[PDB]
Amino acid sequence: FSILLVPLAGISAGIPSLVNNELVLRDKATKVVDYFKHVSLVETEGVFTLLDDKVMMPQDDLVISEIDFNNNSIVLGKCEIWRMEGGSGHTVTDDIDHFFSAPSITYREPHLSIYDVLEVQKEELDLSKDLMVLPNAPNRVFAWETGWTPGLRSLENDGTKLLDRIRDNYEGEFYWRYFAFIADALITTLKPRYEDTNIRINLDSNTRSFIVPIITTEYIREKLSYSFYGSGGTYALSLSQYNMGINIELSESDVWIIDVDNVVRDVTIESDKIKKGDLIEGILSTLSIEENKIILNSHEINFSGEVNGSNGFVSLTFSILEGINAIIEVDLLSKSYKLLIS
Amino acid sequence: SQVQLVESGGGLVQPGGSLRLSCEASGFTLDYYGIGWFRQPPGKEREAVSYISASARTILYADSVKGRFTISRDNAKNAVYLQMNSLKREDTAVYYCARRRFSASSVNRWLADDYDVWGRGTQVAVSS
């Protein structure tokens, strides 16, 4: 429960927008820095942060392409930025890079990886907690540009530090702060290019519970798709109000509980928090059970692997009224379901 | 005049017929925006018809047109399409194309406050 304890994707990292017919995650140099400052927390705090000892939540907008409960490991996804090329007359004057002819940013395919420059523990992780938010960040390649920005050589924080580290890491290919010809130039705008991203989750034989993150922006939301691979455990999943790409690969004796309380009612967002409205009358009209598929409302759950008596019965659950927990018990084998109240 | 959503292809057909509506999205990049189709029958409210999300993955139709209408979009050629089949007389309306705001955090997806650009509509009448 406590779908209210969990923040909305983008609360910390920021939500990208369209300002001039272009996706822009940040628009002021100062503010760009803070984002990096934010990104850097994966080193400082770790991959996962704990909400109240109970819920493991990945860092906001941290691209994770794999969670493996067998290895206790994760794999980071693509987080790159456009490389520079062709400075002339470079010096280091007063800790600030100087140039006669300023370097040019370019979209040409060799891109620099931000994540590579990061020191993160992605192995021997502590995934003991039963409660875990699924990642909310798709693969991206940041465009950017600089602009003449006086008086920001004073700027120093975990953000400027990471930015500096990227410069040093990719010698003569990245300069976020520099003086050229007349005045000081700084990266002013972060312009992401999100990409289709399949997050893979390899499950152990334990009991695990997953909350789909609430991602309001539709565009970003639909770049993601989760692929679960069960191995004979007990798996719980709270769907968001949003129809998300979910594929479940079935192992022998896989028991799946899918909370659909966000599917069967209208859900809105009021003060940057979920707001559960009234149950859709004739919600069962929207329920379609096909061979290796559950369609409820417009949400889709695809199924792969061996379907039999050990793993064919998946339990969709929500609350028909305040104090009535209903279970839609779907039989994948016979494309039939039934209705209980416990 | 920059950002527009011009619809075309409306006219007259006879019950059980079919036609195809066109939306020439102009003056922005609709690879980001989700597009909807709405309609207003004579003397009635504006009505939800179909709604394609940016990138497919969310093709929704109103119960009145399920099975009959089919929605499609060519981001590349910046146009959305609605193929209409088995046209009944109840389908007589003024059909509109509209772009869903990029930031719409509502599952309704037809809320009409979540839409920023609206076309002029094309009328469809159905009578033999």
Tab-separated table of C-alpha atoms in Angstrom:
chain	number	residue	atom	x	y	z
A	1	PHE	CA	0.000	0.000	0.000
A	2	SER	CA	0.977	3.630	0.717
A	3	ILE	CA	0.976	4.556	-2.993
A	4	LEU	CA	1.201	7.999	-1.335
A	5	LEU	CA	4.591	7.254	0.304
A	6	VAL	CA	6.090	6.862	-3.194
A	7	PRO	CA	6.976	10.118	-5.063
A	8	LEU	CA	6.130	10.756	-8.707
A	9	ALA	CA	8.793	10.272	-11.348
A	10	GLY	CA	10.567	13.560	-11.989
A	11	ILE	CA	9.999	15.174	-8.601
A	12	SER	CA	13.763	15.410	-7.990
A	13	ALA	CA	15.340	14.898	-11.421
A	14	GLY	CA	12.866	17.224	-13.112
A	15	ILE	CA	10.293	16.665	-15.853
A	16	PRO	CA	11.382	17.553	-19.432
A	17	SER	CA	9.200	19.879	-21.480
A	18	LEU	CA	8.828	21.401	-24.939
A	19	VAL	CA	9.719	25.084	-25.046
A	20	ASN	CA	10.576	25.752	-28.637
A	21	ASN	CA	9.437	22.670	-30.469
A	22	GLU	CA	12.286	20.843	-28.710
A	23	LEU	CA	12.508	18.655	-25.566
A	24	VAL	CA	14.441	20.547	-22.892
A	25	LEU	CA	15.278	19.092	-19.483
A	26	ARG	CA	17.011	22.270	-18.252
A	27	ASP	CA	17.266	25.755	-19.751
A	28	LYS	CA	19.518	27.766	-17.438
A	29	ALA	CA	23.235	27.008	-16.978
A	30	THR	CA	22.908	27.234	-13.203
A	31	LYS	CA	19.968	24.854	-13.342
A	32	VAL	CA	21.852	22.482	-15.667
A	33	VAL	CA	24.496	22.120	-12.950
A	34	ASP	CA	21.911	21.088	-10.347
A	35	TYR	CA	20.802	18.237	-12.592
A	36	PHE	CA	24.337	16.838	-12.617
A	37	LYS	CA	24.450	17.566	-8.897
A	38	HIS	CA	21.324	15.387	-8.820
A	39	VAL	CA	22.770	12.677	-11.090
A	40	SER	CA	25.859	12.493	-8.893
A	41	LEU	CA	23.823	11.201	-5.941
A	42	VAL	CA	23.983	7.668	-7.352
A	43	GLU	CA	27.620	7.663	-6.172
A	44	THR	CA	26.943	9.465	-2.885
A	45	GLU	CA	23.708	7.752	-1.787
A	46	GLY	CA	23.606	4.634	-3.991
A	47	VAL	CA	21.409	3.148	-6.734
A	48	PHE	CA	18.461	2.659	-4.400
A	49	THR	CA	17.150	4.966	-1.690
A	50	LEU	CA	14.944	3.704	1.156
A	51	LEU	CA	11.473	5.100	1.713
A	52	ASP	CA	10.707	4.338	5.341
A	53	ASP	CA	12.696	1.100	5.721
A	54	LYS	CA	10.194	-0.693	3.517
A	55	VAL	CA	10.425	0.573	-0.058
A	56	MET	CA	13.530	0.533	-2.248
A	57	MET	CA	13.345	3.287	-4.839
A	58	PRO	CA	15.902	3.850	-7.660
A	59	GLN	CA	17.305	7.377	-8.081
A	60	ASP	CA	14.998	9.670	-10.034
A	61	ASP	CA	15.758	9.533	-13.787
A	62	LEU	CA	18.604	7.056	-13.304
A	63	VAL	CA	18.558	4.747	-16.325
A	64	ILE	CA	18.592	1.102	-15.180
A	65	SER	CA	18.430	-1.585	-17.876
A	66	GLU	CA	18.635	-4.636	-15.620
A	67	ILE	CA	17.827	-5.751	-12.089
A	68	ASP	CA	19.014	-9.268	-11.250
A	69	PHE	CA	17.874	-10.858	-7.977
A	70	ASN	CA	20.070	-13.879	-8.721
A	71	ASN	CA	23.342	-11.942	-8.967
A	72	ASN	CA	22.352	-9.085	-6.623
A	73	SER	CA	23.337	-6.800	-9.484
A	74	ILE	CA	22.029	-4.055	-11.748
A	75	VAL	CA	23.119	-2.778	-15.160
A	76	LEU	CA	22.930	0.907	-16.025
A	77	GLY	CA	21.352	2.053	-19.294
A	78	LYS	CA	22.422	4.684	-21.822
A	79	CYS	CA	23.127	8.198	-20.540
A	80	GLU	CA	25.315	10.047	-23.060
A	81	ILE	CA	25.992	13.658	-24.085
A	82	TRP	CA	27.199	15.241	-27.337
A	83	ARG	CA	30.981	15.466	-27.739
A	84	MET	CA	32.999	18.614	-28.590
A	85	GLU	CA	35.726	18.860	-31.194
A	86	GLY	CA	38.168	21.450	-32.530
A	87	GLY	CA	39.336	23.863	-29.859
A	88	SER	CA	42.484	25.936	-30.427
A	89	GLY	CA	44.766	27.653	-27.922
A	90	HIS	CA	43.618	25.756	-24.827
A	91	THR	CA	45.110	26.699	-21.450
A	92	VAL	CA	44.133	26.288	-17.813
A	93	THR	CA	44.000	29.823	-16.422
A	94	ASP	CA	42.768	30.180	-12.825
A	95	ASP	CA	41.174	26.681	-12.886
A	96	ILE	CA	39.043	27.762	-15.864
A	97	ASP	CA	39.770	26.452	-19.364
A	98	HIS	CA	40.730	29.161	-21.864
A	99	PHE	CA	40.613	28.982	-25.690
A	100	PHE	CA	41.402	31.320	-28.544
A	101	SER	CA	38.983	29.500	-30.869
A	102	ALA	CA	36.148	27.885	-28.881
A	103	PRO	CA	35.337	24.150	-29.419
A	104	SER	CA	32.208	23.153	-31.345
A	105	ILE	CA	29.558	20.791	-29.988
A	106	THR	CA	28.527	18.186	-32.550
A	107	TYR	CA	25.828	15.545	-33.005
A	108	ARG	CA	28.236	13.194	-34.804
A	109	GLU	CA	27.648	9.609	-33.619
A	110	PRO	CA	30.599	9.106	-31.149
A	111	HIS	CA	28.894	10.327	-27.949
A	112	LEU	CA	30.405	10.582	-24.463
A	113	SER	CA	28.981	8.434	-21.647
A	114	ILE	CA	28.118	10.231	-18.401
A	115	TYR	CA	27.536	6.949	-16.572
A	116	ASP	CA	31.021	5.638	-17.417
A	117	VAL	CA	32.530	8.546	-15.462
A	118	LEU	CA	30.519	7.409	-12.433
A	119	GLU	CA	31.768	5.214	-9.576
A	120	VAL	CA	28.753	3.107	-8.592
A	121	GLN	CA	28.278	-0.171	-6.749
A	122	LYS	CA	26.141	-2.189	-9.161
A	123	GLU	CA	27.198	-5.512	-7.658
A	124	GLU	CA	26.823	-7.188	-4.252
A	125	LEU	CA	23.700	-5.084	-3.757
A	126	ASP	CA	21.261	-5.366	-0.862
A	127	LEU	CA	17.886	-6.251	-2.375
A	128	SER	CA	16.589	-7.824	0.843
A	129	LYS	CA	13.599	-5.443	0.963
A	130	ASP	CA	10.401	-6.960	-0.433
A	131	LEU	CA	9.241	-3.542	-1.698
A	132	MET	CA	10.844	-1.981	-4.751
A	133	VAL	CA	9.777	0.763	-7.146
A	134	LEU	CA	10.592	-0.144	-10.753
A	135	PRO	CA	13.001	2.292	-12.544
A	136	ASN	CA	11.509	5.314	-14.302
A	137	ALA	CA	14.265	6.448	-16.641
A	138	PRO	CA	14.661	5.598	-20.367
A	139	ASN	CA	17.926	5.549	-22.364
A	140	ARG	CA	18.848	9.077	-23.470
A	141	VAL	CA	21.454	11.050	-25.394
A	142	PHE	CA	21.605	14.674	-24.249
A	143	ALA	CA	22.087	17.409	-26.778
A	144	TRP	CA	23.275	20.682	-25.282
A	145	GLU	CA	24.532	24.134	-26.084
A	146	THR	CA	26.581	26.781	-24.365
A	147	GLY	CA	25.876	30.474	-24.016
A	148	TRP	CA	27.878	33.503	-22.928
A	149	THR	CA	27.345	33.449	-19.159
A	150	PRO	CA	29.433	35.946	-17.103
A	151	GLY	CA	30.412	35.537	-13.474
A	152	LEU	CA	29.968	31.813	-12.828
A	153	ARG	CA	33.581	30.803	-12.200
A	154	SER	CA	32.558	30.938	-8.509
A	155	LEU	CA	30.173	28.019	-9.108
A	156	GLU	CA	31.307	24.878	-7.272
A	157	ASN	CA	29.304	21.848	-6.071
A	158	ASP	CA	28.915	18.104	-6.665
A	159	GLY	CA	27.494	19.142	-10.051
A	160	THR	CA	30.419	21.263	-11.266
A	161	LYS	CA	32.684	18.527	-9.871
A	162	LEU	CA	31.014	15.773	-11.923
A	163	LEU	CA	30.973	18.102	-14.919
A	164	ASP	CA	34.704	18.762	-14.432
A	165	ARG	CA	35.323	15.017	-14.061
A	166	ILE	CA	33.665	14.408	-17.424
A	167	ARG	CA	35.904	17.059	-19.009
A	168	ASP	CA	39.055	15.439	-17.638
A	169	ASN	CA	37.814	11.942	-18.501
A	170	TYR	CA	37.337	12.838	-22.177
A	171	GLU	CA	40.341	15.103	-22.745
A	172	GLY	CA	39.560	17.800	-25.319
A	173	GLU	CA	36.028	16.522	-26.081
A	174	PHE	CA	33.938	18.161	-23.343
A	175	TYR	CA	34.075	21.683	-21.913
A	176	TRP	CA	31.138	22.867	-19.821
A	177	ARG	CA	32.752	26.116	-18.625
A	178	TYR	CA	35.381	28.061	-20.600
A	179	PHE	CA	36.562	31.451	-21.818
A	180	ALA	CA	36.852	32.025	-25.589
A	181	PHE	CA	37.732	35.161	-27.534
A	182	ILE	CA	35.725	37.755	-25.462
A	183	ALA	CA	33.811	36.284	-22.466
A	184	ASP	CA	33.017	33.128	-20.472
A	185	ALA	CA	30.701	30.476	-21.999
A	186	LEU	CA	28.680	27.846	-20.100
A	187	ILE	CA	26.365	24.955	-20.932
A	188	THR	CA	22.947	26.605	-20.745
A	189	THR	CA	20.517	23.929	-21.982
A	190	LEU	CA	20.057	20.162	-21.569
A	191	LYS	CA	18.049	18.765	-24.489
A	192	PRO	CA	17.483	14.975	-24.045
A	193	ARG	CA	16.719	12.417	-26.733
A	194	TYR	CA	14.959	9.541	-24.978
A	195	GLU	CA	15.021	6.126	-26.615
A	196	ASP	CA	13.110	2.863	-26.352
A	197	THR	CA	14.373	1.089	-23.250
A	198	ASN	CA	13.596	-2.463	-22.153
A	199	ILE	CA	14.190	-2.937	-18.416
A	200	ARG	CA	14.855	-6.614	-17.684
A	201	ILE	CA	14.086	-8.110	-14.268
A	202	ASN	CA	15.492	-11.524	-13.412
A	203	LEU	CA	13.554	-12.922	-10.449
A	204	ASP	CA	14.702	-15.357	-7.749
A	205	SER	CA	12.498	-17.874	-5.918
A	206	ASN	CA	11.730	-15.440	-3.072
A	207	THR	CA	8.758	-13.127	-2.471
A	208	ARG	CA	9.150	-9.762	-4.200
A	209	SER	CA	6.787	-6.800	-4.655
A	210	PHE	CA	7.086	-4.196	-7.415
A	211	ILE	CA	5.397	-0.809	-7.787
A	212	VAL	CA	5.176	0.631	-11.294
A	213	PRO	CA	6.365	4.281	-10.970
A	214	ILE	CA	3.869	7.016	-11.685
A	215	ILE	CA	5.170	8.722	-14.822
A	216	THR	CA	2.776	11.507	-15.829
A	217	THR	CA	4.463	12.508	-19.111
A	218	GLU	CA	3.031	10.117	-21.685
A	219	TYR	CA	5.941	10.330	-24.157
A	220	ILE	CA	8.607	9.265	-21.677
A	221	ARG	CA	6.272	6.692	-20.087
A	222	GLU	CA	5.857	4.801	-23.310
A	223	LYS	CA	9.572	4.507	-24.077
A	224	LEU	CA	9.833	2.084	-21.149
A	225	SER	CA	8.863	-1.573	-21.164
A	226	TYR	CA	9.430	-4.098	-18.384
A	227	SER	CA	10.381	-7.720	-19.038
A	228	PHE	CA	10.013	-10.037	-16.041
A	229	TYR	CA	11.548	-13.520	-15.954
A	230	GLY	CA	10.155	-15.579	-13.061
A	231	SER	CA	11.931	-18.585	-11.507
A	232	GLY	CA	9.237	-20.169	-9.318
A	233	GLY	CA	8.597	-17.514	-6.656
A	234	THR	CA	5.801	-15.198	-5.485
A	235	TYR	CA	5.589	-11.925	-7.359
A	236	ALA	CA	3.466	-8.852	-6.627
A	237	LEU	CA	2.930	-5.879	-8.938
A	238	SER	CA	1.034	-2.602	-8.387
A	239	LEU	CA	0.185	-1.176	-11.796
A	240	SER	CA	0.113	2.612	-12.110
A	241	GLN	CA	-2.990	4.305	-13.535
A	242	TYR	CA	-1.062	4.275	-16.821
A	243	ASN	CA	-1.084	1.360	-19.278
A	244	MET	CA	2.540	0.217	-19.235
A	245	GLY	CA	4.420	-2.312	-21.356
A	246	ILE	CA	4.721	-5.355	-19.101
A	247	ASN	CA	5.883	-8.770	-20.274
A	248	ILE	CA	5.922	-11.679	-17.821
A	249	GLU	CA	7.868	-14.830	-18.629
A	250	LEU	CA	6.376	-17.736	-16.667
A	251	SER	CA	8.420	-20.350	-14.815
A	252	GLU	CA	7.023	-23.471	-13.121
A	253	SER	CA	4.988	-22.608	-9.995
A	254	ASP	CA	5.073	-18.836	-10.584
A	255	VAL	CA	2.351	-17.143	-8.534
A	256	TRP	CA	1.526	-13.602	-9.639
A	257	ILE	CA	-0.596	-11.039	-7.781
A	258	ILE	CA	-1.311	-7.915	-9.824
A	259	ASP	CA	-2.880	-4.991	-7.978
A	260	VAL	CA	-5.154	-3.204	-10.447
A	261	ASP	CA	-6.676	-0.708	-8.021
A	262	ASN	CA	-5.200	1.989	-10.263
A	263	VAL	CA	-6.765	0.417	-13.366
A	264	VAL	CA	-10.380	-0.092	-12.284
A	265	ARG	CA	-11.027	3.469	-11.084
A	266	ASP	CA	-10.312	6.891	-12.550
A	267	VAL	CA	-6.986	8.189	-11.265
A	268	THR	CA	-5.821	11.805	-11.482
A	269	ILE	CA	-2.969	13.831	-10.006
A	270	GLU	CA	-3.876	16.693	-7.688
A	271	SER	CA	-0.950	18.041	-5.677
A	272	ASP	CA	1.814	16.068	-7.396
A	273	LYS	CA	0.262	13.043	-5.673
A	274	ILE	CA	-2.002	10.239	-6.928
A	275	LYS	CA	-5.746	10.794	-6.486
A	276	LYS	CA	-7.868	7.650	-6.619
A	277	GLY	CA	-11.341	8.456	-7.979
A	278	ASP	CA	-14.474	6.365	-8.523
A	279	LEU	CA	-14.604	2.813	-9.900
A	280	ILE	CA	-15.368	2.501	-13.622
A	281	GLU	CA	-18.868	1.008	-13.883
A	282	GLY	CA	-18.638	-1.785	-16.473
A	283	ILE	CA	-14.873	-2.058	-16.024
A	284	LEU	CA	-15.360	-5.768	-16.758
A	285	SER	CA	-16.553	-4.740	-20.211
A	286	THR	CA	-12.942	-3.772	-20.891
A	287	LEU	CA	-11.509	-7.037	-19.584
A	288	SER	CA	-10.270	-9.184	-22.461
A	289	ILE	CA	-8.447	-12.452	-21.829
A	290	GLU	CA	-6.550	-13.776	-24.831
A	291	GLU	CA	-4.013	-16.602	-25.214
A	292	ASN	CA	-0.919	-15.309	-23.369
A	293	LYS	CA	-2.541	-11.896	-22.754
A	294	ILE	CA	-4.614	-10.027	-20.173
A	295	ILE	CA	-6.190	-6.755	-21.303
A	296	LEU	CA	-7.836	-4.829	-18.470
A	297	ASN	CA	-9.077	-1.381	-19.350
A	298	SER	CA	-6.383	-0.419	-21.834
A	299	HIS	CA	-3.550	-1.922	-19.779
A	300	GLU	CA	-1.772	-4.855	-21.408
A	301	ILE	CA	0.020	-7.766	-19.754
A	302	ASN	CA	1.742	-10.108	-22.224
A	303	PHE	CA	2.815	-13.596	-21.134
A	304	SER	CA	5.642	-15.812	-22.422
A	305	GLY	CA	6.962	-19.256	-21.427
A	306	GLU	CA	5.257	-22.438	-20.157
A	307	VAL	CA	1.612	-22.006	-19.206
A	308	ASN	CA	0.161	-24.835	-17.104
A	309	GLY	CA	-1.712	-25.528	-13.852
A	310	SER	CA	1.254	-24.352	-11.764
A	311	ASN	CA	1.401	-20.846	-13.220
A	312	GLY	CA	-1.772	-20.343	-15.286
A	313	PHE	CA	-3.808	-18.719	-12.507
A	314	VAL	CA	-2.902	-15.060	-12.005
A	315	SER	CA	-4.720	-13.027	-9.337
A	316	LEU	CA	-5.789	-9.487	-10.251
A	317	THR	CA	-6.890	-7.611	-7.117
A	318	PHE	CA	-8.318	-4.231	-6.149
A	319	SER	CA	-11.027	-2.862	-3.936
A	320	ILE	CA	-14.508	-2.833	-5.412
A	321	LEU	CA	-15.564	-0.735	-2.422
A	322	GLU	CA	-13.988	0.714	0.737
A	323	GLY	CA	-13.576	-2.487	2.755
A	324	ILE	CA	-14.192	-5.061	-0.003
A	325	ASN	CA	-11.049	-6.579	-1.578
A	326	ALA	CA	-12.012	-8.261	-4.864
A	327	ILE	CA	-9.955	-10.839	-6.789
A	328	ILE	CA	-10.310	-11.364	-10.519
A	329	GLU	CA	-8.844	-14.870	-10.828
A	330	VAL	CA	-7.866	-15.297	-14.489
A	331	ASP	CA	-7.167	-18.701	-16.026
A	332	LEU	CA	-4.815	-18.129	-18.971
A	333	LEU	CA	-5.315	-21.706	-20.161
A	334	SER	CA	-9.061	-21.511	-20.735
A	335	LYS	CA	-9.254	-17.748	-21.388
A	336	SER	CA	-11.740	-17.604	-18.495
A	337	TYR	CA	-11.946	-15.752	-15.183
A	338	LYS	CA	-13.996	-15.592	-11.972
A	339	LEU	CA	-14.793	-13.113	-9.195
A	340	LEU	CA	-14.179	-13.402	-5.457
A	341	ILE	CA	-14.390	-11.229	-2.347
A	342	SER	CA	-12.031	-12.023	0.545
B	1	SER	CA	0.428	30.667	-39.765
B	2	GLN	CA	2.621	28.124	-37.940
B	3	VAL	CA	0.889	25.626	-35.566
B	4	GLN	CA	-2.344	24.231	-37.213
B	5	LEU	CA	-4.250	20.912	-37.345
B	6	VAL	CA	-6.192	20.992	-40.677
B	7	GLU	CA	-8.620	18.072	-41.196
B	8	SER	CA	-10.022	16.843	-44.523
B	9	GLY	CA	-11.969	13.978	-46.135
B	10	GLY	CA	-15.482	14.603	-44.764
B	11	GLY	CA	-18.598	14.612	-46.923
B	12	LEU	CA	-21.668	12.476	-47.606
B	13	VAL	CA	-22.013	8.685	-47.555
B	14	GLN	CA	-24.842	6.148	-47.305
B	15	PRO	CA	-25.368	3.691	-44.384
B	16	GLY	CA	-22.815	0.867	-44.376
B	17	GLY	CA	-20.338	2.984	-46.336
B	18	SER	CA	-16.928	4.307	-45.299
B	19	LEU	CA	-14.416	7.150	-45.773
B	20	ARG	CA	-11.045	8.320	-44.439
B	21	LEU	CA	-10.320	11.514	-42.572
B	22	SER	CA	-6.964	13.297	-42.824
B	23	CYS	CA	-5.106	15.610	-40.452
B	24	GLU	CA	-2.191	17.611	-41.875
B	25	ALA	CA	-0.303	18.524	-38.701
B	26	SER	CA	1.580	21.706	-39.501
B	27	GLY	CA	3.937	24.145	-37.778
B	28	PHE	CA	5.288	21.837	-35.055
B	29	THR	CA	6.717	18.325	-34.655
B	30	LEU	CA	4.052	15.762	-33.834
B	31	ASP	CA	6.443	12.996	-32.908
B	32	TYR	CA	5.900	14.115	-29.316
B	33	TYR	CA	2.189	14.902	-29.198
B	34	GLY	CA	-0.642	12.399	-28.920
B	35	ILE	CA	-3.551	13.145	-31.249
B	36	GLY	CA	-7.258	12.677	-30.689
B	37	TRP	CA	-10.395	12.569	-32.824
B	38	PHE	CA	-13.618	14.045	-31.441
B	39	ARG	CA	-17.024	14.644	-32.979
B	40	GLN	CA	-20.045	16.858	-32.466
B	41	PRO	CA	-23.395	15.444	-33.718
B	42	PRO	CA	-26.181	17.998	-34.465
B	43	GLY	CA	-27.635	19.370	-31.227
B	44	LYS	CA	-25.315	17.264	-29.067
B	45	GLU	CA	-22.171	17.767	-26.988
B	46	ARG	CA	-18.667	17.190	-28.328
B	47	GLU	CA	-17.980	13.456	-28.279
B	48	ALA	CA	-14.842	11.310	-27.923
B	49	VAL	CA	-14.090	9.101	-30.960
B	50	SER	CA	-10.561	7.687	-31.116
B	51	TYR	CA	-7.201	8.776	-29.730
B	52	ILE	CA	-3.741	7.717	-30.892
B	53	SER	CA	-0.796	8.287	-28.552
B	54	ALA	CA	2.605	9.449	-29.809
B	55	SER	CA	4.345	6.214	-30.848
B	56	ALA	CA	1.135	4.086	-30.980
B	57	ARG	CA	1.173	1.813	-27.884
B	58	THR	CA	-2.113	3.440	-26.921
B	59	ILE	CA	-4.764	3.238	-29.595
B	60	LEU	CA	-8.114	3.915	-27.916
B	61	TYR	CA	-11.595	3.992	-29.478
B	62	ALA	CA	-14.983	5.054	-28.086
B	63	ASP	CA	-17.536	2.233	-27.658
B	64	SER	CA	-19.693	3.675	-30.504
B	65	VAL	CA	-16.973	3.105	-33.138
B	66	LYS	CA	-15.074	0.056	-31.834
B	67	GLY	CA	-14.641	-2.458	-34.659
B	68	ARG	CA	-15.570	0.125	-37.301
B	69	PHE	CA	-13.058	3.002	-37.099
B	70	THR	CA	-9.272	2.573	-37.321
B	71	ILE	CA	-6.696	5.211	-36.332
B	72	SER	CA	-3.146	5.532	-37.665
B	73	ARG	CA	-0.433	8.184	-37.870
B	74	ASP	CA	2.618	8.795	-40.016
B	75	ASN	CA	4.946	10.802	-37.789
B	76	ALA	CA	7.386	10.886	-40.723
B	77	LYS	CA	4.789	12.470	-43.043
B	78	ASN	CA	3.293	14.464	-40.086
B	79	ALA	CA	-0.333	13.313	-40.548
B	80	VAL	CA	-2.836	11.245	-38.539
B	81	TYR	CA	-5.630	9.248	-40.220
B	82	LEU	CA	-9.016	7.831	-39.240
B	83	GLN	CA	-10.458	5.113	-41.494
B	84	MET	CA	-14.216	4.890	-41.042
B	85	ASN	CA	-16.169	1.763	-41.976
B	86	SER	CA	-19.796	0.632	-41.730
B	87	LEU	CA	-20.983	4.236	-41.453
B	88	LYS	CA	-24.314	4.489	-39.617
B	89	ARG	CA	-26.573	7.543	-39.530
B	90	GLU	CA	-25.618	8.017	-35.887
B	91	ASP	CA	-22.106	8.866	-37.113
B	92	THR	CA	-23.446	12.094	-38.616
B	93	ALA	CA	-21.322	14.749	-36.905
B	94	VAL	CA	-18.554	17.322	-37.297
B	95	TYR	CA	-15.278	15.448	-36.754
B	96	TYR	CA	-12.349	17.252	-35.068
B	97	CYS	CA	-8.627	16.536	-34.728
B	98	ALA	CA	-6.834	17.800	-31.630
B	99	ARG	CA	-3.388	17.491	-30.016
B	100	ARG	CA	-3.100	16.310	-26.439
B	101	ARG	CA	-0.950	18.579	-24.299
B	102	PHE	CA	2.504	17.037	-23.739
B	103	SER	CA	2.094	17.185	-19.924
B	104	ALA	CA	-1.406	15.630	-19.586
B	105	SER	CA	-1.390	13.646	-16.316
B	106	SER	CA	-4.882	12.184	-16.612
B	107	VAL	CA	-5.895	8.708	-17.748
B	108	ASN	CA	-9.018	10.000	-19.399
B	109	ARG	CA	-7.092	11.138	-22.484
B	110	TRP	CA	-10.098	13.041	-23.819
B	111	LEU	CA	-10.473	15.791	-21.211
B	112	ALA	CA	-10.618	18.735	-23.663
B	113	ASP	CA	-8.595	20.789	-21.206
B	114	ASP	CA	-5.707	18.494	-21.996
B	115	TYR	CA	-5.816	19.638	-25.648
B	116	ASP	CA	-4.004	22.744	-26.948
B	117	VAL	CA	-4.454	22.854	-30.738
B	118	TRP	CA	-7.859	22.222	-32.409
B	119	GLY	CA	-8.584	22.021	-36.160
B	120	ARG	CA	-11.593	23.401	-37.924
B	121	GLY	CA	-13.252	20.001	-38.155
B	122	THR	CA	-14.686	18.372	-41.248
B	123	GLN	CA	-18.388	17.444	-41.351
B	124	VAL	CA	-19.533	13.922	-42.083
B	125	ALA	CA	-23.158	13.236	-42.991
B	126	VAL	CA	-24.467	9.730	-43.621
B	127	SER	CA	-27.663	9.373	-45.691
B	128	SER	CA	-28.572	7.354	-48.818
